[PDB]
Amino acid sequence: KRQVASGRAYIHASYNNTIVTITDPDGNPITWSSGGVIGYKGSRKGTPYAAQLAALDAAKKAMAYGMQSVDVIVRGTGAGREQAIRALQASGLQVKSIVDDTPVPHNGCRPKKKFR
Amino acid sequence: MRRYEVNIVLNPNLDQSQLALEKEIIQRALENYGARVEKVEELGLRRLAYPIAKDPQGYFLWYQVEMPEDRVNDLARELRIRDNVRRVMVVKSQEPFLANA
Amino acid sequence: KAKVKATLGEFDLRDYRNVEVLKRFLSETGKILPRRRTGLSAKEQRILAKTIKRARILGLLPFTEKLVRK
Amino acid sequence: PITKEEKQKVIQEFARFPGDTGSTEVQVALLTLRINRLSEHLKVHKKDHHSHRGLLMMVGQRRRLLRYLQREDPERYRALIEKLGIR
RNA sequence: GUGGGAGAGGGUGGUGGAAUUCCCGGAGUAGCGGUGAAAUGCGCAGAUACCGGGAGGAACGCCGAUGGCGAAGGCAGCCACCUGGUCCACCCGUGACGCUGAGGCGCGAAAGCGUGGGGAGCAAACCGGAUUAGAUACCCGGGUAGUCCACGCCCUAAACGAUGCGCGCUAGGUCUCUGGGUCUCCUGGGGGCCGAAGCUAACGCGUUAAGCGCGCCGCCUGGGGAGUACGGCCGCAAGGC
Ligand SMILES: [Mg+2]
Ligand SMILES: [Mg+2]
Ligand SMILES: [Mg+2]
Ligand SMILES: [Mg+2]
Ligand SMILES: [Mg+2]
Ligand SMILES: [Mg+2]
Ligand SMILES: [Mg+2]
Ligand SMILES: [Mg+2]
Ligand SMILES: [Mg+2]
Ligand SMILES: [Mg+2]
Ligand SMILES: [Mg+2]
Ligand SMILES: [Mg+2]
Ligand SMILES: [Mg+2]
Ligand SMILES: [Mg+2]
Ligand SMILES: [Mg+2]
Ligand SMILES: [Mg+2]
Ligand SMILES: [Mg+2]
Ligand SMILES: [Mg+2]
Ligand SMILES: [Mg+2]
Ligand SMILES: [Mg+2]
Ligand SMILES: [Mg+2]
Ligand SMILES: [Mg+2]
Ligand SMILES: [Mg+2]
Ligand SMILES: [Mg+2]
Ligand SMILES: [Mg+2]
Ligand SMILES: [Mg+2]
Ligand SMILES: [Mg+2]
Ligand SMILES: [Mg+2]
Ligand SMILES: [Mg+2]
Ligand SMILES: [Mg+2]
Ligand SMILES: [Mg+2]
Ligand SMILES: [Mg+2]
Ligand SMILES: [Mg+2]
Ligand SMILES: [Mg+2]
Ligand SMILES: [Mg+2]
Ligand SMILES: [Mg+2]
Ligand SMILES: [Mg+2]
Ligand SMILES: [Mg+2]
Ligand SMILES: [Mg+2]
Ligand SMILES: [Mg+2]
Ligand SMILES: [Mg+2]
Ligand SMILES: [Mg+2]
Ligand SMILES: [Mg+2]
Ligand SMILES: [Mg+2]
Incomplete structure (x- = not known):
């Protein structure tokens, strides 16, 4: 209903899930998918397959609003962080660029014992 | 008296009425704190490395002065008062350490 | 690879204001390069660290950048 | 701090003769000037315990030359x- | 003394960006989260993911090191003021003024205590979910004291180099920080590694001694009872010597 046809794709990849958002050039989102959006429920969502199908689910949802050009942004290390990218390139969406923007603190906040 | 270097970055949207006022304000503040000015370098519009005050550029000033040391931090306090003044960084002058000489 | 001090001129290591030359010591991200990549001495790198941090606060050198790859 | 302008003013006042830089009187003068610099710095800055150690060392050396x-x-x-108005 | 030098040494004020959390707005559906699997938890009052604006607190990525500084505890963004220690060159001055050090006094991580602040993240106790034969636990979701600041207490430690201090002497080689020099190198002052002589029960130490000597302090004399009992001093208490 928008006809954006150019914009950004954010891959949020953790060890428990891989989830993909697609926005317009200004950053405001359009559609999105994830490991849970497709049928997967538990630990399966943080798999490269779920990463693939999630990237492709949002990539077809963006075809509705007419997306062709896509700028990829990646945050987090995760299984299928790369597999969601590789899926995104073959989605028909012409991938403009790929950037890794994973936030790293300058040692500011005390992590949970899990990360200690 | 020791010798310092004053760095002042202000908002790069001023017309002349405000640019003169802002700098003749920096003169007035220096006078009251006893800063003899040895030399000045006015660079002006420079592309900043990151957004400062939502503005992608900044107007650059540099002064080399000699003043009493006890008064320096109250001079920093007096320059950052101005809304248009964004960065005040005052460094004690050092010898130009060369490398690959 | 080549080292930074090797392909350069005679410069002021203490000048926080010269961006054209200080940009040559940053990586693709804003990170300050190790001595193995700058070819500097123990005393020089310590001084460079401080001068780059000075330039970062004046908005001349970046704190961190975005890597365009992967 | 203590500039060499003020240093010489003291060394010339307590020298036993022109050119004397190391007399006991001159040392005890120069120590005492640093003592009074530090104890006025330590009236404020009471929580500076590392500078306080430097002072305990100066008094020890100043009272060692006077004891001599x-x-x-x-x-x-x-x-x-x-x-010097001491003791 | 003079003239130079390096440094997260200390105290005070100021300040910068990254990240977490919360609030506001924009946009946007059906889950997010989390684990070995999970569940409690959160989500249609619209979360997670994304863009922007704001508040607040704590810690400083890269530089960063086998590195530097300090008597030890310990010290890491940047700027300025106050300030301590230390090292080198000159061979200038005083003329044994030295060393150690029972007492005394000052310092003393973390935790804990008092009064008043502060409170983002983390997190004893605790509230739950799991696992389990049981779970008073590791794993998961929550969360108070506290961690942070001011002032005053507490005085412990694997407070470690398990090696008290100062001085003289006794092959070198090699890496390194930092001075000076006639700058393949020489010469100081630190920090590492091999190793002469020698010591050691052995492992190992070896110009940074655990070697050869001297001065002075501390301390030891089988394990359990026991750092307990009593007494004393100290402490608001926990408790300490
Ligand atoms: Mg999962
Ligand atoms: Mg993380
Ligand atoms: Mg990590
Ligand atoms: Mg990791
Ligand atoms: Mg850790
Ligand atoms: Mg301002
Ligand atoms: Mg000096
Ligand atoms: Mg310091
Ligand atoms: Mg909202
Ligand atoms: Mg519910
Ligand atoms: Mg708040
Ligand atoms: Mg490191
Ligand atoms: Mg040391
Ligand atoms: Mg230690
Ligand atoms: Mg000094
Ligand atoms: Mg002589
Ligand atoms: Mg004589
Ligand atoms: Mg004692
Ligand atoms: Mg203590
Ligand atoms: Mg504590
Ligand atoms: Mg308290
Ligand atoms: Mg928590
Ligand atoms: Mg917990
Ligand atoms: Mg069992
Ligand atoms: Mg023993
Ligand atoms: Mg012991
Ligand atoms: Mg050696
Ligand atoms: Mg040299
Ligand atoms: Mg040595
Ligand atoms: Mg032998
Ligand atoms: Mg050895
Ligand atoms: Mg010798
Ligand atoms: Mg010895
Ligand atoms: Mg005993
Ligand atoms: Mg036994
Ligand atoms: Mg017995
Ligand atoms: Mg037994
Ligand atoms: Mg016992
Ligand atoms: Mg006990
Ligand atoms: Mg008795
Ligand atoms: Mg008792
Ligand atoms: Mg009592
Ligand atoms: Mg008890
Ligand atoms: Mg006890």
Whole structure:
């Protein structure tokens, strides 16, 4: 209903899930998918397959609003962080660029014992 | 008296009425704190490395002065008062350490 | 690879204001390069660290950048 | 701090003769000037315990030179003390 | 003394960006989260993911090191003021003024205590979910004291180099920080590694001694009872010597 046809794709990849958002050039989102959006429920969502199908689910949802050009942004290390990218390139969406923007603190906040 | 270097970055949207006022304000503040000015370098519009005050550029000033040391931090306090003044960084002058000489 | 001090001129290591030359010591991200990549001495790198941090606060050198790859 | 302008003013005031930089009186003068610099710095900054250690070392060395002057020539000791207002 | 030098040494004020959390707005559906699997938890009052604006607190990525500084505890963004220690060159001055050090006094991580602040993240106790034969636990979701600041207490430690301090002497080689020099190198002052002589029960130490000597302090004399009992001093208490 928008006809954006150019914009950004954010891959949020953790060890428990891989989830993909697609926005317009200004950053405001359009559609999105994830490991849970497709049928997967538990630990399966943080798999490269779920990463693939999630990237492709949002990539077809963006075809509705007419997306062709896509700028990829990646945050987090995760299984299928790369597999969601590789899926995104073959989605028909012409991938403009790929950037890794994973936030790293300058040692500011005390992590949970899990990360200690 | 020791010798310092004053760095002042202000908002790069001023017309002349405000640019003169802002700098003749920096003169007035220096006078009251006893800063003899040895030399000045006015660079002006420079592309900043990151957004400062939502503005992608900044107007650059540099002064080399000699003043009493006890008064320096109250001079920093007096320059950052101005809304248009964004960065005040005052460094004690050092010898130009060369490398690959 | 080549080292930074090797392909350069005679410069002021203490000048926080010269961006054209200080940009040559940053990586693709804003990170300050190790001595193995700058070819500097123990005393020089310590001084460079401080001068780059000075330039970062004046908005001349970046704190961190975005890597365009992967 | 203590500039060499003020240093020389003291060394010339307490020298036993022109050119003397190391007399006991001159050392005890120069230590005492640093003592009074530090104890006024320590009236404020009470929580600075590392500078306080430097002071305990100066008093030890200042009282070690005075304990020496007392033994050899007790006159120059009083004329030094009465001139520095100590003890 | 003079003239130079390096440094997260200390105290005070100021300040910068990254990240977490919360609030506001924009946009946007059906889950997010989390684990070995999970569940409690959160989500249609619209979360997670994304863009922007704001508040607040704590810690400083890269530089960063086998590195530097300090007597030890310990010290890491940047700027300025106050300030301590230390090292080198000159061979200038005093003329044994030295060393150690029972007492005394000062310092003393973390935790804990008092009064008043502060409170983002983390997190004893605790509230739950799991696992389990049981779970008073590791794993998961929550969360108070506290961690942070001011002032005053507490005085412990694997407070470690398990090696008290100062000085003289006794092959070198090699890496390194930092001075000076006639700058393949020489010469100081630190920090590492091999190793002469020698010591050691052995492992190992070896110009940074655990070697050869001297001065002075501390301390030891089988394990359990026991750092307990009593007494004393100290502490608001926990408790300490
Ligand atoms: Mg999962
Ligand atoms: Mg993380
Ligand atoms: Mg990590
Ligand atoms: Mg990791
Ligand atoms: Mg860790
Ligand atoms: Mg301002
Ligand atoms: Mg000096
Ligand atoms: Mg410091
Ligand atoms: Mg909202
Ligand atoms: Mg519910
Ligand atoms: Mg708040
Ligand atoms: Mg490191
Ligand atoms: Mg040391
Ligand atoms: Mg230690
Ligand atoms: Mg100094
Ligand atoms: Mg002589
Ligand atoms: Mg003589
Ligand atoms: Mg004692
Ligand atoms: Mg303590
Ligand atoms: Mg504590
Ligand atoms: Mg308290
Ligand atoms: Mg928590
Ligand atoms: Mg917990
Ligand atoms: Mg069992
Ligand atoms: Mg033993
Ligand atoms: Mg012991
Ligand atoms: Mg050696
Ligand atoms: Mg040299
Ligand atoms: Mg050595
Ligand atoms: Mg042998
Ligand atoms: Mg050895
Ligand atoms: Mg020798
Ligand atoms: Mg020895
Ligand atoms: Mg005993
Ligand atoms: Mg037994
Ligand atoms: Mg017995
Ligand atoms: Mg037994
Ligand atoms: Mg026992
Ligand atoms: Mg006990
Ligand atoms: Mg008894
Ligand atoms: Mg008792
Ligand atoms: Mg009592
Ligand atoms: Mg108890
Ligand atoms: Mg106890």
